[PDB]
Design an enzyme around this catalytic site. Sequence first.
Site, PDB file in Angstrom:
ATOM      1  N   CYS C 151       0.823  -1.207   0.000  1.00 20.14           N
ATOM      2  CA  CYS C 151       0.000   0.000   0.000  1.00 20.14           C
ATOM      3  C   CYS C 151       0.860   1.260   0.000  1.00 20.14           C
ATOM      4  O   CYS C 151       0.587   2.212  -0.740  1.00 20.14           O
ATOM      5  CB  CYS C 151      -0.935  -0.012   1.211  1.00 20.14           C
ATOM      6  SG  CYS C 151      -0.132  -0.455   2.771  1.00 20.14           S
ATOM      7  N   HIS C 178       1.254   5.852   9.817  1.00 18.59           N
ATOM      8  CA  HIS C 178       0.456   4.702   9.423  1.00 18.59           C
ATOM      9  C   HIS C 178      -0.527   4.317  10.520  1.00 18.59           C
ATOM     10  O   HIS C 178      -0.217   4.418  11.710  1.00 18.59           O
ATOM     11  CB  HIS C 178       1.360   3.511   9.097  1.00 18.59           C
ATOM     12  CG  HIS C 178       0.766   2.549   8.116  1.00 18.59           C
ATOM     13  ND1 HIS C 178      -0.202   1.634   8.465  1.00 18.59           N
ATOM     14  CD2 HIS C 178       1.006   2.361   6.798  1.00 18.59           C
ATOM     15  CE1 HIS C 178      -0.536   0.922   7.404  1.00 18.59           C
ATOM     16  NE2 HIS C 178       0.185   1.343   6.379  1.00 18.59           N
TER      17      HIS C 178
END
Lengths: 334, 334, 334, 334
Positions: C151, C178
């Site tokens: 990702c 994140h």
Amino acid sequence: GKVKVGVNGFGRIGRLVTRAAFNSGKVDIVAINDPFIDLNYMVYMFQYDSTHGKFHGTVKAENGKLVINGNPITIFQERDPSKIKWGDAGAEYVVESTGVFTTMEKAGAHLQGGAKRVIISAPSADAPMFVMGVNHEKYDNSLKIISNASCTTNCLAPLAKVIHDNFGIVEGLMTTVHAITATQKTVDGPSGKLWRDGRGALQNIIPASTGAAKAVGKVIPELNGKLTGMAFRVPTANVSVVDLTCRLEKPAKYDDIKKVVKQASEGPLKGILGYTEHQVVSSDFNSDTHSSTFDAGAGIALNDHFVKLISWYDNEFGYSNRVVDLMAHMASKE
Amino acid sequence: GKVKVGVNGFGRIGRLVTRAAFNSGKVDIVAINDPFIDLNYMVYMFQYDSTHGKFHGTVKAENGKLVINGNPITIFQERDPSKIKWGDAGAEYVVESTGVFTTMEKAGAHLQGGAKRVIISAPSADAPMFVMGVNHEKYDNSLKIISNASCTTNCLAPLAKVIHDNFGIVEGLMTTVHAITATQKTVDGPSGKLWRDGRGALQNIIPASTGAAKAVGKVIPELNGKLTGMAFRVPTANVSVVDLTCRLEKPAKYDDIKKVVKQASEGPLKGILGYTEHQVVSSDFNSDTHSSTFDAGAGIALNDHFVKLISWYDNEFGYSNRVVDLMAHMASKE
Amino acid sequence: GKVKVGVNGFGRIGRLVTRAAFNSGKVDIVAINDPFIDLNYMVYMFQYDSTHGKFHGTVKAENGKLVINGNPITIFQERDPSKIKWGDAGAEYVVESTGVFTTMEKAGAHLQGGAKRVIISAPSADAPMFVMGVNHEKYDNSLKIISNASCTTNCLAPLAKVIHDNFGIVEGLMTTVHAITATQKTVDGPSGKLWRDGRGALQNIIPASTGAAKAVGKVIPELNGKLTGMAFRVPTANVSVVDLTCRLEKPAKYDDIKKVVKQASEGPLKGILGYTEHQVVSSDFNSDTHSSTFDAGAGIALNDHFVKLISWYDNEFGYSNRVVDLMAHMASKE
Amino acid sequence: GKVKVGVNGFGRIGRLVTRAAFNSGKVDIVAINDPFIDLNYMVYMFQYDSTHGKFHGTVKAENGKLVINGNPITIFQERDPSKIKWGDAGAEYVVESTGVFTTMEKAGAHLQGGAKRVIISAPSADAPMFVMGVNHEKYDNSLKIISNASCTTNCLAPLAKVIHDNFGIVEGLMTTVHAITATQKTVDGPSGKLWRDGRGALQNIIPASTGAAKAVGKVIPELNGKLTGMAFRVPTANVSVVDLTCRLEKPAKYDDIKKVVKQASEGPLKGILGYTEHQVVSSDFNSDTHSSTFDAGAGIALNDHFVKLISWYDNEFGYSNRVVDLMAHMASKE
């Protein structure tokens, strides 16, 4: 035939009431008043939401009017409620959602602005209270200022009405685990009267006192003086849960409790009271329009006369949809 | 005269039991067994804690032994409990804290390792249960394998015993708002039997079933079959709260309830049951060694026979200190 | 003409890949393999989601097959990937999403099960890497086992390709904030190799090392050896943000940077790279299908050769949609 | 010989400054002014803290004076700073911590109240700035109104001074991951100017602009015009981290960077700049009094002239201790 609705205040309740009215289409919003939010900031506030996501539709500003889905909305910035020209904007019903005009005299300032009826989206000391699906048939159209109680009362009512009509609640107590509130402080802050509510909302559990369980006796007069409770405010975002411990008059097994709640959720209380048997959690009721949803697997019974029942409710959407549903029933009674 | 204690497992309960033993000094830890944690990782785990902060003292590794405050500790990595040489390390009492050997036959594997007595830091199906300050005088030194119940039971027992001895609890129900543990999932994960416990702990409220209220009847035999309850797991870190709704036999005003709890917290249950009248929240009980603390301002009474009582508890420290306090009372009974 | 897709593993990536395939309709899922989840638990997992809400459609179990929107899906519970009968189920492409078969030899076990091509939804040490919109035209149909990177790489790639093609990135450093991961621990837990990732995810910030910035040089060969970075894992739920600090060869004002990114987001990189000028936050990108969205107002430039660019990405939905978009491009190349 | 200190405002900075002064003993607090907090609420606020725990000592109210550890403190409730009788209370130095009197003219209102010198615990537009351990030797005792910058500047300064003196920072950029503060909103709320800061702090990441990196050039004049940066506000409680990406003039391996930082943290910058090589997380620096702590394992170097350095800081305690440390150095210069 839809009624014209004005909204006083563009806080959380006002924005979700506008969103529920545009999503459902039962009423139409023609006017919004807020003295501290300008037009482009109103566009930004209505377009983006952390809890319920982006608005499904178009919102923009043109010619000093907020335009949502092609419908222009008059914007007022008046601070005195008696000075707002509701009649010039065409508004017939006014939602008082600021939380500071809750008495009949304070919320009656809107009537010389041209409005006909005032609905208070908060508990009131002297205005009559109505909960949809419980006592909303008692409205008689000669009442100008009424209130819609609160989210917790709207969750607890239909539920206690079903149990009392079938088994006869002798006495009961309620505990609600509630999500954070705008009045809570991100970090330890100065709360003048409620010292516990000034502590940090992200780090704490924070017991609180509430009058929602006592307000059921105003809406159901047979249960007057038989219910009380308190609350806990945990660091979640939107969804709350009601915990009711009651003593019954007639014997009731837990399978018999589940049968009458499931039958009530289908015919009479469809869309107001829900029923589930799945292994749900709190985020499964995000943006759910039910006032309360009965959790069959979470409750427990000690014997045939002493039970504990668990109910869920989205305190933002459900309550905001009940304000719209109450207003549509008022317009059909004219 | 202090007894030698071995710890089986270096999880959360084992690390906090070691920390409580080194902070209090009532017992001494001589041996730790864990097949999945090496020595330097044990130093890292014991030195740093997110909830209770850094360890007050010195911890280091030398010659294959964990040294805490100058005291060397033998480390085993055996997976079979019958193969651990507890007798060679000098350990006399063994704390079984892994949570997988809870029956008498499974936790009796430690006795051919050289150990004398086994204390299970979990509820057990067949071992006798003891809660400090309630029924710990019933220990008679001919019992080799006993259990220390659980944190929720340790919180609920003291209050119940005081209320039943003064007013006669006829029946009662309990709800506990519990902090997240280790078995919960950070994000939606695969829980084989309990499907609700596999959902994301950061975003959810998660009703759960518990047997702590039923286990009070094992510890107080007069209350057998008169208590039950459930739990909610909210996204906080350490501190939980117990919510007990009970029906009394004798009349009791709320001022009379507050008087007998405050008197019990001073003389007989000093250090086990606490009492406060301040406007506390959940983070005010972080690293508190009481089993339960009565919140006078948070409870509510409907009438003289139907009350709701609120009590708090640090489910990590308090419980871990009760394991040490139980072990010291066992050593004085030899 | 849609290809038949098998999914190995019903974790977070597998469930969101199935959801993206049923939402978009570009491919069709015919088979799911998981040795630890049964059929009714699969129905429960796919129906309810804490992050992305309830599934829009019907999901039920009948005759041992998972039925989603009327489409039955074969379920396997095999643990050996070479024993899964992908060819009997009709699956032509297999998504390896368990995270444990990432090399070419380990992920090549699916080919004697009857599958034709394997797509690994993870970084791979020896399989070729493809990022949609950057180097996906280099696929040549003679490759049986390829990977889709990650990702973070999918967010960073499109952005760095636009900047390098217009201004010539000399060197660059990167930082990503994140959201939590399934591998993280709800409370301090035992992580064998990465000691920082065993600490409590609710209470901590947790620096981590990543190879996503180095993997851009594999996908863009001109930037090989010119990018590196690290990451922070904060206690949010889904949405992450990429922070890139780079030195440019050609002069570039911040208005010139905004112009070429906005032009690239319209024509060539439509749907992959986004562009916004609003005052957005992290929850505004929940369930957004873009690989990366450029935040014009959040970045800052020190001079004409030293800038810091800010990008957003939903690390669950966007990446899962890129796996489907890569598979559809592979099927058109046959 | 300790100086008498008055505190204006009992917010977070004022309470932690009072706590740091009573914990360290370098100065003495004799007077506190706040027009919105009464005496018993001051006792409640100072006694209990969600982040740093209960106060270690005795705090009570008697005869209209706040008594902490036996020391009575005069309480004022004046709203006009020129009307506060600082000279009657004996206060010589006044900490202006309300955040609304930051210019020299506004914060100079305390001097006709009887005070001698004013220290502003905030960045100021025209007052001279001082950071302890960097430029605090430039204070010359003829300055009446000075400022102490901010927490982020106090973290970044010592670090950038060491790197520039050894390797010559050519240019640099900074990103800080910051914990939530008091100005943030628990849920989406109305922020008039900063629209991003009105969104819900529990659910969001929220990019923000800061002038802390530019303010280093005021404190270190050689780095003027060479530093800039921004910030992210994540939903944690207390501890923040600074992320600095810089280009060096002289070659520097990462082992050479680690050596000069470790040497500076021992001799010259002892207690201001810290150094660690352990696998730390954010909660390991809770109630740490260092301005900044260098994380050796978290940083990364691309080559010998392009590095990224990671530093930690408790933005509550450390900064509040620097205000006390600055005041003690001022009193020794008289």
